[PDB]
Amino acid sequence: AAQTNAPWGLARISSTSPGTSTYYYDESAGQGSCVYVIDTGIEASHPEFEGRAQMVKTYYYSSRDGNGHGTHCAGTVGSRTYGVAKKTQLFGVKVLDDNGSGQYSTIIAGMDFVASDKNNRNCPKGVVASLSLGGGYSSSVNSAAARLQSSGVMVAVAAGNNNADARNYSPASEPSVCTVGASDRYDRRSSFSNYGSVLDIFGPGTDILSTWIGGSTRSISGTSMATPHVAGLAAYLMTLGKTTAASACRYIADTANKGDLSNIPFGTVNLLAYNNYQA
């Protein structure tokens, strides 16, 4: 399959060169896999989700996405026009309020909930959790992320937007999960993106157009945008049988475009997420 005039980020994921405009992907498109988007919620009614999105859990007074962040990230995982894995099943867990924040206690609860909830869902090709959030270091938060991973969910987390070593952030610092930096359309490290030895992979993160609330769209930037590129890619490759939840992060690093990125500090991977599609 090919999507012409696709957002730059999706075209990059399936190309060895920057500057192309088509998203070449396999038509399975993540069918049979499920992705929990742990964030502000999802506007499940947006036409771009075609009914594949569902709010399963909220920790506030309502399950609606009043921010837009969760809807934008879910759109990059799985929307028809803006999404990596266009047929995957999306589940929303609202651990962040409509201002974008939430306590570690709630985030840990949401992560533990996904670990057990996945035993009530039909996800034959496997389960992915996308976490585009974080903050200062916490070993309780790291350890929740490690538990989520060890229960058989592919955990992808944002490295954070501080242009610093992500070793001082969580869950970004947890070694057993997949920590995602951000790049821009000219294969430069995005100027805000954290770096360091804990990073596993880079994905597109600057000027990412995706879905938004009110059935609209918009383009924003962050390692929060790079993370669902990688979470969607994992669900894409799990559906294909290329890798498992336990191994997907390491498979994506094995098969990445190597050395292409600019402005990468010594000690940090030069690896850009890539789907290796061959028509």
112 is in an annotated binding site: no
Give the integer Cα–Cα distance in Å for 236 and 227: 14
Q: Is 191 a catalytic residue?
A: no
Residue nearer to Ca ion on the CB measure, 123 or 180: 180
Report in angstroms how near the CB of residue 130 gets to Ca ion at its nearest: 15
Q: Is 224 a catalytic residue?
A: yes
Report in angstroms how near the CB of residue 193 gets to Ca ion at its nearest: 16
11 closest CA partner among 262, 257, 223: 257
Catalytic residue among 14, 46, 69, 138: 69
Residue nearer to Ca ion on the CB measure, 6 or 230: 230
16 is in an annotated binding site: yes
Report in angstroms how near the CB of residue 239 gets to Ca ion at its nearest: 22
Q: Quick check: 246 and 176 in contact, CB under 8 A?
A: no
Q: Where are the beta strands (DSSP E) in the chain?
A: 2-3, 23-24, 33-39, 53-58, 89-94, 126-131, 135-136, 154-158, 169-170, 178-183, 201-204, 208-212, 216-220, 257-258, 271-272
Pair of tokens at residue 162: 């501080």
Catalytic residue among 28, 46, 224, 229: 224
Q: Site residues (CB under 5 A) for Ca ion?
A: 175, 200
Q: Is 187 a catalytic residue?
A: no
Residue nearer to Ca ion on the CB measure, 11 or 133: 133
Catalytic residue among 14, 15, 28, 39: 39
84 closest CA partner among 165, 156, 168: 156
Q: Output the known binding site.
A: 16, 175, 177, 200, 260
Catalytic residue positions, numbered: 39, 69, 224
